[PDB]
Design a protein around this ligand. Structure first.
Ligand SMILES: NC(=O)c1cc(=O)[nH]c(=O)n1[C@@H]1O[C@H](COP(=O)(O)O)[C@@H](O)[C@H]1O
Ligand SMILES: NC(=O)c1cc(=O)[nH]c(=O)n1[C@@H]1O[C@H](COP(=O)(O)O)[C@@H](O)[C@H]1O
Ligand code: PRO
Ligand code: PRO
Lengths: 256, 256
């Protein structure tokens, strides 16, 4: 098993994956903040304060009450200053002709500002081919949803295997997974795991939590995605630091 | 097998399904227009001209270059005038806590104007429970994606069975399916089928077409969803009429 810095240099690495792995190693962070907020000012204040602690900021642009492209310009300034990627959790999930338009156009213009997006694999590989027509010219990357954290997830067994094959067959554009565990044996792919909290439990609507030690250390994932465990805390910076230190030490211990 | 008008009166019918089935019977239309356009003016001109020919207008609000809530006010005026439902093809596809926010909030405020939305079932039933927290108070309905039209679709076998169970167990809010065929034996549920064109073929990005006669007549679906077969034609009104007459006669012949 290679360090994040050595994985950044692998022959088949995607440039977006390489940039991410290099800043993960430099900053000693494998934490992705899930910035599930409704106010642009709160998104930007979190991005600025937590930027040094995170390798990535996951957005849901469609829950911002005051979205504008100027907000995303300000977010890019912070991502460049603090060195983290912007991942829009769009969950593209239809035929290629549709998702192509959803990625480039509309009021969000997601491909213009998002380093990473993700897709569900349920439509078959046309979802990736459609996104790649916009993403490859813009030097972007994509994550495929191979497993989900929620109760009753159908992203199991042959579904998960199909996501891994689709990723491995589209390595020009697909850089990794949303998953609960390592699902690819190829070290060029990133594994990002949501459903993470320091304490046991869940929510009222099917979310299930596992710890950073479990996710990174035992299940072999690379990055934890954390929303409410940070966002609902009083001191979001200290919370982010606790999650960062947990995920980083779990990674170091696994690497030995 | 009951007529659309008799299905509208079934004891367990959802009010949104009842309204739809009644206007389908009144207008002799089981056509849903897929208005996959980038300009508000084109969306509204299509809605006005084709409104009499359709039971439903499917939107992708996120590909409109000039979305505003005032556009959706003008669309509602046309839906009321011509009697069709508005279905936003949002493909909600994550944990309940996230989709709840995506449905009510953000710049689109989808629940404020969409009679129907749809969801992927991959996250498990929390996707429905989250949407229902916003949709049930607003008297809205939801469709679950049980099958997909595209090459390599993973919405097959046990996945499809899980979608049908999730619908049948959430009948207060779920009114039907996106599917290629009848998947529920319960007549209170609507079946809407995309991937429809009069001529054989597909597209360059995994779309596959079947005819209205095949979809409605042999596969037992209720409604055809048609985009490019209408939208790319020179005379969109005549194209809509050809699709309407095809789907309506296939329905009549199956009913006998
Ligand atoms: N698409 C994902 O990353 C995703 C896939 C999945 O299986 N499970 C899951 O929790 N997520 C997304 O990650 C975030 C979790 O937020 P939290 O529960 O930590 O507040 C939240 O934004 C949620 O939408
Ligand atoms: N979500 C759906 O309705 C859906 C599910 C699915 O399996 N297959 C599918 O084609 N659709 C959506 O229907 C529309 C088809 O557009 P067309 O190919 O007729 O131009 C287009 O807007 C596409 O996104
Ligand atoms: O010098 C570095 O940071 C990288 C890490 C692996 C080898 N070179
Ligand atoms: O009169 C009608 O239109 C409805 C249809 C079934 C029975 N009553």
């Amino acid at each position: 098993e290679l360090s994040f810095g050595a994985r950044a240099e692998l022959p088949r690495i995607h440039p977006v994956a390489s940039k991410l792995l290099r800043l993960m190693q430099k900053k000693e962070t494998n934490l992705c903040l899930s910035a599930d907020v409704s106010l642009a000012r709160e998104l930007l204040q979190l991005a600025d304060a937590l930027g040094p602690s995170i390798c990535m900021l996951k957005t849901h642009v469609d829950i911002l009450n005051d979205f504008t492209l100027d907000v995303m310009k300000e977010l890019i300034t912070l991502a460049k200053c603090h060195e983290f990627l912007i991942f829009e959790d769009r969950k593209f999930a239809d035929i290629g002709n549709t998702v192509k338009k959803q990625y480039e156009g509309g009021i969000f213009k997601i491909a213009s500002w998002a380093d990473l997006v993700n897709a569900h694999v349920v439509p078959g590989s046309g979802v990736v081919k459609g996104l790649q027509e916009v993403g490859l010219p813009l030097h972007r990357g994509c994550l495929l949803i191979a497993e989900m954290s929620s109760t009753g997830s159908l992203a199991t067994g042959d579904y998960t295997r199909a996501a891994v094959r689709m990723a491995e067959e589209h390595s020009e554009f697909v850089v990794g997974f949303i998953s609960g565990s390592r699902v690819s044996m190829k070290p060029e792919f990133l594994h990002l795991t949501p459903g993470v909290q320091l304490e046991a439990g869940g929510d009222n609507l099917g979310q299930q939590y596992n710890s950073p030690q479990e996710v990174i250390g035992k299940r072999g994932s690379d990055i934890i995605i954390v929303g409410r465990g940070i966002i609902s805390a009083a001191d979001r910076l200290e919370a982010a630091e606790m999650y960062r230190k947990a995920a980083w030490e779990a990674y170091l211990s696994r690497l030995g």
